[PDB]
């Protein structure tokens, strides 16, 4: 359980570098270089953790190590846009390609052994790596690289759909929710690539397919709540928020103001539902499920922030910023309670919610002036 908690801490550190790169978009070159140095350090540390997890046979810890590697490449690509550095954008592209190739081998090994949870996490690392490739290709202006992102992301979407159906037939609702997370992240990679290419039809297909993921995640959350699995229910709410982020990105490029207003309404329902799961998880003592509920709250506020910025809704933007600070304070209290009871996994997951809430705050500051 120590290798899993170590990888989750590296995930939170990678998200901290993303917020640093997002804040540099203030237009500060030295701030963008500080986010670069943190991203390369997290990438190297997660590489050593991946080798240790593979040496011990912990496929779950090895997959989480690759997820931190993909988030480190995303921060490197975001710094490339702020610095206009094509040489550094090429390095982020190369590092993201190595994560995609490593996660592909791990997904095959986990599928043959029956570990559906580890296989779903490997697909999440592939989808996150494709987001880094899309951002790096945008900084380079490579139309050939943008088309490769769309083709690879379609393979991740198809692999996650087969894994979701297999997990649903076996009753593994945790792996089924993780498979829907990889689908929503893969659609985000396509949306970013289709925007730079100006593909209206592909953006229209992302919107309808993300709605299908949103409806499937609502069914998993209701089934997990009936069985008493609050961990799977919180993961299903995370997939709901990530699917709404993909719909917002597509509605932004297509100029669908009515769809953006529906995203805010739906994301508010996910945020309120995640608050009920948090109260139920804390009452029964499930600190891992409670931390995942705060993660779903932060992602739901990110979807609200993106839609309100494109709509110019300052009242809703101010509301999401206030709720983001409330999530950050609650996660700090949960981290103290988790370490007081020796639950290092929940303590690391609470740190991920803090970094996610800081990303939403950075998004609000980006639109201010």
Short mmCIF file of C-alpha atoms in Angstrom, two decimals:
data_model
loop_
_atom_site.label_atom_id
_atom_site.label_comp_id
_atom_site.label_asym_id
_atom_site.label_seq_id
_atom_site.Cartn_x
_atom_site.Cartn_y
_atom_site.Cartn_z
CA UNK A 1 0.00 0.00 0.00
CA UNK A 2 3.08 2.21 0.29
CA UNK A 3 3.90 2.22 -3.43
CA UNK A 4 0.35 3.27 -4.33
CA UNK A 5 0.36 6.15 -1.83
CA UNK A 6 3.77 7.28 -3.11
CA UNK A 7 2.48 7.45 -6.69
CA UNK A 8 -0.60 9.45 -5.69
CA UNK A 9 1.67 12.02 -4.02
CA UNK A 10 3.61 12.32 -7.29
CA UNK A 11 0.29 12.86 -9.09
CA UNK A 12 -0.51 15.80 -6.81
CA UNK A 13 2.96 17.27 -7.41
CA UNK A 14 2.43 17.02 -11.17
CA UNK A 15 -0.89 18.87 -10.87
CA UNK A 16 0.92 21.58 -8.90
CA UNK A 17 3.23 22.09 -11.89
CA UNK A 18 0.20 22.38 -14.18
CA UNK A 19 -1.23 25.18 -12.04
CA UNK A 20 2.19 26.85 -12.16
CA UNK A 21 2.17 26.66 -15.96
CA UNK A 22 -1.44 27.88 -16.11
CA UNK A 23 -0.59 30.89 -13.94
CA UNK A 24 2.31 31.74 -16.27
CA UNK A 25 -0.15 32.11 -19.18
CA UNK A 26 0.30 36.65 -15.98
CA UNK A 27 2.79 36.25 -18.85
CA UNK A 28 5.94 35.50 -16.86
CA UNK A 29 8.87 33.66 -18.44
CA UNK A 30 10.60 32.90 -15.12
CA UNK A 31 7.39 31.39 -13.73
CA UNK A 32 7.11 29.13 -16.78
CA UNK A 33 10.70 27.97 -16.29
CA UNK A 34 10.00 27.10 -12.64
CA UNK A 35 7.09 24.89 -13.73
CA UNK A 36 9.41 23.20 -16.23
CA UNK A 37 12.01 22.30 -13.59
CA UNK A 38 9.30 20.83 -11.36
CA UNK A 39 7.85 18.82 -14.25
CA UNK A 40 11.16 17.18 -15.19
CA UNK A 41 11.82 16.29 -11.55
CA UNK A 42 8.40 14.66 -11.12
CA UNK A 43 8.87 12.83 -14.43
CA UNK A 44 12.20 11.37 -13.30
CA UNK A 45 10.89 10.45 -9.84
CA UNK A 46 7.84 8.70 -11.31
CA UNK A 47 10.13 6.76 -13.67
CA UNK A 48 12.01 5.29 -10.71
CA UNK A 49 8.72 4.48 -8.98
CA UNK A 50 7.46 2.75 -12.13
CA UNK A 51 10.53 0.49 -12.19
CA UNK A 52 10.13 -0.36 -8.50
CA UNK A 53 6.43 -1.18 -8.89
CA UNK A 54 7.18 -3.37 -11.91
CA UNK A 55 10.01 -5.06 -9.99
CA UNK A 56 7.54 -5.93 -7.20
CA UNK A 57 4.59 -6.80 -9.46
CA UNK A 58 2.34 -3.93 -8.30
CA UNK A 59 0.58 -3.15 -11.57
CA UNK A 60 -1.74 -0.62 -9.92
CA UNK A 61 1.18 1.39 -8.50
CA UNK A 62 2.99 1.15 -11.84
CA UNK A 63 -0.05 2.54 -13.68
CA UNK A 64 -0.42 5.45 -11.25
CA UNK A 65 3.27 6.22 -11.81
CA UNK A 66 2.60 6.54 -15.55
CA UNK A 67 -0.36 8.83 -14.84
CA UNK A 68 1.97 11.19 -12.97
CA UNK A 69 4.36 10.99 -15.93
CA UNK A 70 1.58 12.05 -18.31
CA UNK A 71 0.54 14.98 -16.11
CA UNK A 72 4.19 16.09 -16.01
CA UNK A 73 4.28 16.14 -19.81
CA UNK A 74 1.08 18.22 -19.87
CA UNK A 75 2.74 20.90 -17.73
CA UNK A 76 5.75 20.89 -20.06
CA UNK A 77 3.47 21.44 -23.06
CA UNK A 78 1.59 24.25 -21.30
CA UNK A 79 4.91 25.97 -20.57
CA UNK A 80 5.79 25.65 -24.26
CA UNK A 81 2.79 27.81 -25.18
CA UNK A 82 3.77 30.47 -22.64
CA UNK A 83 7.45 30.45 -23.65
CA UNK A 84 6.91 29.89 -27.41
CA UNK A 85 9.76 27.35 -27.15
CA UNK A 86 9.51 24.87 -30.02
CA UNK A 87 12.54 22.91 -28.77
CA UNK A 88 10.89 22.33 -25.40
CA UNK A 89 7.57 21.52 -27.08
CA UNK A 90 9.41 18.76 -28.96
CA UNK A 91 10.75 17.31 -25.70
CA UNK A 92 7.26 17.22 -24.17
CA UNK A 93 6.05 15.42 -27.30
CA UNK A 94 8.80 12.80 -27.00
CA UNK A 95 8.19 12.24 -23.28
CA UNK A 96 4.44 11.86 -23.83
CA UNK A 97 5.08 9.28 -26.56
CA UNK A 98 7.17 7.17 -24.17
CA UNK A 99 4.35 7.17 -21.60
CA UNK A 100 1.85 6.08 -24.27
CA UNK A 101 4.09 3.19 -25.34
CA UNK A 102 4.76 2.12 -21.75
CA UNK A 103 1.08 2.25 -20.79
CA UNK A 104 0.15 0.19 -23.87
CA UNK A 105 2.36 -2.69 -22.70
CA UNK A 106 1.01 -2.44 -19.15
CA UNK A 107 -2.60 -2.49 -20.39
CA UNK A 108 -1.89 -5.70 -22.32
CA UNK A 109 -0.18 -7.34 -19.34
CA UNK A 110 -2.95 -6.34 -16.93
CA UNK A 111 -5.68 -7.58 -19.29
CA UNK A 112 -4.08 -11.02 -19.61
CA UNK A 113 -3.82 -11.35 -15.82
CA UNK A 114 -7.42 -10.27 -15.20
CA UNK A 115 -6.57 -7.04 -13.36
CA UNK A 116 -9.29 -4.85 -14.87
CA UNK A 117 -8.57 -1.99 -12.45
CA UNK A 118 -4.89 -1.81 -13.41
CA UNK A 119 -5.82 -2.05 -17.10
CA UNK A 120 -8.25 0.86 -16.80
CA UNK A 121 -5.62 3.03 -15.10
CA UNK A 122 -3.21 2.25 -17.95
CA UNK A 123 -5.79 3.57 -20.43
CA UNK A 124 -6.14 6.74 -18.33
CA UNK A 125 -2.39 7.30 -18.64
CA UNK A 126 -2.72 6.90 -22.41
CA UNK A 127 -5.53 9.46 -22.61
CA UNK A 128 -3.66 11.95 -20.43
CA UNK A 129 -0.54 11.47 -22.57
CA UNK A 130 -2.59 12.29 -25.68
CA UNK A 131 -3.68 15.56 -24.05
CA UNK A 132 0.01 16.46 -23.68
CA UNK A 133 0.64 15.53 -27.33
CA UNK A 134 -2.24 17.76 -28.44
CA UNK A 135 -0.99 20.75 -26.44
CA UNK A 136 2.59 20.20 -27.63
CA UNK A 137 1.41 19.94 -31.24
CA UNK A 138 -0.55 23.19 -30.84
CA UNK A 139 2.61 24.98 -29.70
CA UNK A 140 4.43 23.55 -32.73
CA UNK A 141 1.61 24.03 -35.24
CA UNK A 142 2.09 20.50 -36.61
CA UNK A 143 -1.03 19.43 -38.50
CA UNK A 144 0.43 15.93 -38.93
CA UNK A 145 0.91 15.51 -35.17
CA UNK A 146 -2.63 16.74 -34.47
CA UNK A 147 -4.08 14.09 -36.80
CA UNK A 148 -2.07 11.36 -35.05
CA UNK A 149 -3.56 12.41 -31.70
CA UNK A 150 -7.09 11.90 -33.05
CA UNK A 151 -6.28 8.44 -34.42
CA UNK A 152 -4.58 7.25 -31.23
CA UNK A 153 -7.36 8.66 -29.04
CA UNK A 154 -9.96 6.72 -31.02
CA UNK A 155 -8.09 3.51 -30.17
CA UNK A 156 -8.11 4.43 -26.47
CA UNK A 157 -11.86 5.12 -26.67
CA UNK A 158 -12.53 1.73 -28.26
CA UNK A 159 -10.32 -0.15 -25.79
CA UNK A 160 -12.03 1.56 -22.84
CA UNK A 161 -15.48 0.67 -24.22
CA UNK A 162 -14.61 -3.03 -24.38
CA UNK A 163 -13.19 -2.86 -20.85
CA UNK A 164 -16.30 -1.09 -19.56
CA UNK A 165 -18.60 -3.78 -20.95
CA UNK A 166 -16.41 -6.54 -19.51
CA UNK A 167 -16.29 -4.88 -16.09
CA UNK A 168 -20.06 -4.33 -16.07
CA UNK A 169 -20.71 -8.02 -16.78
CA UNK A 170 -18.37 -9.04 -13.94
CA UNK A 171 -19.81 -6.49 -11.50
CA UNK A 172 -16.52 -4.57 -11.16
CA UNK A 173 -18.04 -1.10 -10.89
CA UNK A 174 -14.70 0.46 -9.87
CA UNK A 175 -13.04 -0.64 -13.12
CA UNK A 176 -16.16 0.34 -15.08
CA UNK A 177 -16.05 3.87 -13.68
CA UNK A 178 -12.31 4.10 -14.40
CA UNK A 179 -12.96 2.98 -17.98
CA UNK A 180 -15.46 5.82 -18.43
CA UNK A 181 -12.85 8.23 -17.06
CA UNK A 182 -10.41 7.20 -19.80
CA UNK A 183 -13.15 7.70 -22.40
CA UNK A 184 -13.89 11.24 -21.18
CA UNK A 185 -10.18 12.12 -21.12
CA UNK A 186 -9.70 10.71 -24.63
CA UNK A 187 -12.53 12.91 -25.92
CA UNK A 188 -10.84 15.94 -24.33
CA UNK A 189 -7.68 15.15 -26.31
CA UNK A 190 -9.69 14.94 -29.54
CA UNK A 191 -11.54 18.18 -28.79
CA UNK A 192 -8.29 20.09 -28.28
CA UNK A 193 -6.85 18.63 -31.50
CA UNK A 194 -10.02 19.26 -33.51
CA UNK A 195 -10.14 22.90 -32.38
CA UNK A 196 -6.63 23.58 -33.68
CA UNK A 197 -7.49 21.81 -36.96
CA UNK A 198 -10.88 23.50 -37.36
CA UNK A 199 -12.82 20.22 -37.68
CA UNK A 200 -16.43 21.12 -36.92
CA UNK A 201 -17.83 17.64 -37.58
CA UNK A 202 -15.36 15.93 -35.23
CA UNK A 203 -16.22 18.49 -32.55
CA UNK A 204 -19.91 17.68 -33.05
CA UNK A 205 -19.16 13.97 -32.63
CA UNK A 206 -17.24 14.63 -29.41
CA UNK A 207 -20.27 16.41 -27.93
CA UNK A 208 -22.72 13.56 -28.54
CA UNK A 209 -20.27 10.84 -27.52
CA UNK A 210 -19.42 12.70 -24.31
CA UNK A 211 -23.15 12.84 -23.53
CA UNK A 212 -23.25 9.05 -23.85
CA UNK A 213 -20.37 8.74 -21.37
CA UNK A 214 -22.23 11.15 -19.08
CA UNK A 215 -25.38 8.99 -19.12
CA UNK A 216 -23.41 5.78 -18.56
CA UNK A 217 -21.59 7.31 -15.59
CA UNK A 218 -24.94 8.30 -14.06
CA UNK A 219 -26.12 4.68 -14.21
CA UNK A 220 -22.92 3.37 -12.60
CA UNK A 221 -23.25 5.92 -9.80
CA UNK A 222 -26.83 4.81 -9.10
CA UNK A 223 -25.88 1.12 -9.16
CA UNK A 224 -22.83 1.65 -6.95
CA UNK A 225 -24.95 3.58 -4.45
CA UNK A 226 -27.45 0.71 -4.28
CA UNK A 227 -24.67 -1.80 -3.60
CA UNK A 228 -23.08 0.49 -0.99
CA UNK A 229 -19.83 1.04 -2.92
CA UNK A 230 -19.10 4.72 -2.35
CA UNK A 231 -15.66 4.41 -3.97
CA UNK A 232 -17.17 3.44 -7.33
CA UNK A 233 -19.91 6.06 -6.91
CA UNK A 234 -17.35 8.83 -6.39
CA UNK A 235 -15.35 7.59 -9.38
CA UNK A 236 -18.53 7.67 -11.48
CA UNK A 237 -19.09 11.30 -10.47
CA UNK A 238 -15.51 12.06 -11.54
CA UNK A 239 -16.31 10.63 -14.98
CA UNK A 240 -19.44 12.80 -15.07
CA UNK A 241 -17.44 15.98 -14.46
CA UNK A 242 -14.74 15.04 -16.98
CA UNK A 243 -17.41 14.31 -19.60
CA UNK A 244 -18.95 17.74 -19.01
CA UNK A 245 -15.52 19.31 -19.56
CA UNK A 246 -15.37 17.68 -23.00
CA UNK A 247 -18.85 18.97 -23.86
CA UNK A 248 -17.86 22.51 -22.83
CA UNK A 249 -14.71 22.48 -24.98
CA UNK A 250 -16.76 21.35 -27.99
CA UNK A 251 -19.53 23.87 -27.30
CA UNK A 252 -16.91 26.63 -26.98
CA UNK A 253 -15.46 26.08 -30.46
CA UNK A 254 -18.91 25.54 -32.01
CA UNK A 255 -20.32 28.68 -30.37
CA UNK A 256 -23.20 26.87 -28.63
CA UNK A 257 -24.18 29.26 -25.84
CA UNK A 258 -27.25 27.19 -24.92
CA UNK A 259 -25.12 24.07 -24.46
CA UNK A 260 -22.70 25.97 -22.21
CA UNK A 261 -25.61 27.06 -20.00
CA UNK A 262 -26.72 23.43 -19.74
CA UNK A 263 -23.18 22.39 -18.76
CA UNK A 264 -23.24 24.79 -15.80
CA UNK A 265 -26.60 23.40 -14.66
CA UNK A 266 -25.45 19.78 -14.99
CA UNK A 267 -22.08 20.39 -13.33
CA UNK A 268 -23.88 22.02 -10.40
CA UNK A 269 -25.84 18.77 -9.97
CA UNK A 270 -22.64 16.70 -9.96
CA UNK A 271 -21.14 19.07 -7.37
CA UNK A 272 -24.17 18.79 -5.08
CA UNK A 273 -24.31 15.00 -5.51
CA UNK A 274 -20.61 14.70 -4.65
CA UNK A 275 -21.24 16.64 -1.43
CA UNK A 276 -23.81 14.04 -0.34
CA UNK A 277 -21.37 11.21 -1.08
CA UNK A 278 -18.72 12.98 1.01
CA UNK A 279 -21.06 13.28 4.00
CA UNK A 280 -22.07 9.62 3.71
CA UNK A 281 -18.47 8.42 3.34
CA UNK A 282 -17.30 10.39 6.37
CA UNK A 283 -20.19 9.03 8.46
CA UNK A 284 -19.23 5.41 7.70
CA UNK A 285 -15.48 6.03 7.92
CA UNK A 286 -14.54 5.51 4.25
CA UNK A 287 -11.81 8.14 3.95
CA UNK A 288 -10.72 6.92 0.51
CA UNK A 289 -14.21 7.40 -0.91
CA UNK A 290 -14.50 10.75 0.88
CA UNK A 291 -11.33 12.04 -0.80
CA UNK A 292 -12.56 10.89 -4.22
CA UNK A 293 -15.78 12.83 -3.60
CA UNK A 294 -13.78 16.03 -3.09
CA UNK A 295 -11.89 15.26 -6.31
CA UNK A 296 -15.22 15.09 -8.14
CA UNK A 297 -16.20 18.43 -6.59
CA UNK A 298 -13.04 20.15 -7.86
CA UNK A 299 -13.46 18.77 -11.38
CA UNK A 300 -17.12 19.84 -11.43
CA UNK A 301 -16.04 23.39 -10.57
CA UNK A 302 -13.48 23.28 -13.39
CA UNK A 303 -16.30 22.54 -15.84
CA UNK A 304 -18.30 25.43 -14.37
CA UNK A 305 -15.32 27.78 -14.67
CA UNK A 306 -14.65 26.89 -18.31
CA UNK A 307 -18.27 27.47 -19.34
CA UNK A 308 -18.65 30.70 -17.36
CA UNK A 309 -15.45 32.14 -18.86
CA UNK A 310 -16.64 31.49 -22.42
CA UNK A 311 -20.08 32.91 -21.58
CA UNK A 312 -18.64 35.90 -19.74
CA UNK A 313 -20.66 35.02 -16.62
CA UNK A 314 -18.82 36.84 -13.83
CA UNK A 315 -21.46 35.98 -11.22
CA UNK A 316 -21.09 32.23 -11.81
CA UNK A 317 -17.31 32.59 -12.09
CA UNK A 318 -17.17 34.25 -8.67
CA UNK A 319 -19.36 31.50 -7.20
CA UNK A 320 -17.11 28.73 -8.51
CA UNK A 321 -14.04 30.49 -7.08
CA UNK A 322 -15.64 30.68 -3.63
CA UNK A 323 -16.63 27.00 -3.70
CA UNK A 324 -13.14 26.03 -4.89
CA UNK A 325 -11.65 27.57 -1.75
CA UNK A 326 -14.19 25.66 0.35
CA UNK A 327 -13.12 22.38 -1.27
CA UNK A 328 -9.45 23.22 -0.65
CA UNK A 329 -10.10 23.85 3.05
CA UNK A 330 -12.14 20.66 3.46
CA UNK A 331 -9.43 18.60 1.76
CA UNK A 332 -6.81 20.04 4.11
CA UNK A 333 -8.90 18.91 7.09
CA UNK A 334 -9.38 15.45 5.57
CA UNK A 335 -5.63 15.11 4.96
CA UNK A 336 -5.02 15.85 8.64
CA UNK A 337 -7.62 13.27 9.69
CA UNK A 338 -6.24 10.65 7.29
CA UNK A 339 -2.64 10.93 8.50
CA UNK A 340 -3.90 10.92 12.10
CA UNK A 341 -5.41 7.47 11.44
CA UNK A 342 -2.55 6.17 9.29
CA UNK A 343 -4.49 6.16 5.99
CA UNK A 344 -1.73 7.30 3.64
CA UNK A 345 -3.81 6.49 0.55
CA UNK A 346 -6.66 8.81 1.56
CA UNK A 347 -4.15 11.46 2.66
CA UNK A 348 -2.51 11.40 -0.78
CA UNK A 349 -5.89 11.51 -2.53
CA UNK A 350 -6.84 14.55 -0.43
CA UNK A 351 -3.69 16.27 -1.71
CA UNK A 352 -4.85 15.62 -5.29
CA UNK A 353 -8.11 17.42 -4.50
CA UNK A 354 -6.13 20.41 -3.19
CA UNK A 355 -4.09 20.65 -6.39
CA UNK A 356 -7.23 20.23 -8.50
CA UNK A 357 -8.96 23.03 -6.58
CA UNK A 358 -5.90 25.23 -7.15
CA UNK A 359 -6.17 24.58 -10.90
CA UNK A 360 -9.77 25.84 -10.86
CA UNK A 361 -8.62 28.94 -8.97
CA UNK A 362 -5.87 29.49 -11.54
CA UNK A 363 -8.48 29.26 -14.31
CA UNK A 364 -10.52 32.01 -12.64
CA UNK A 365 -7.45 34.25 -12.34
CA UNK A 366 -6.65 33.69 -16.03
CA UNK A 367 -9.97 35.25 -17.09
CA UNK A 368 -9.67 38.18 -14.66
CA UNK A 369 -8.54 41.12 -16.80
#
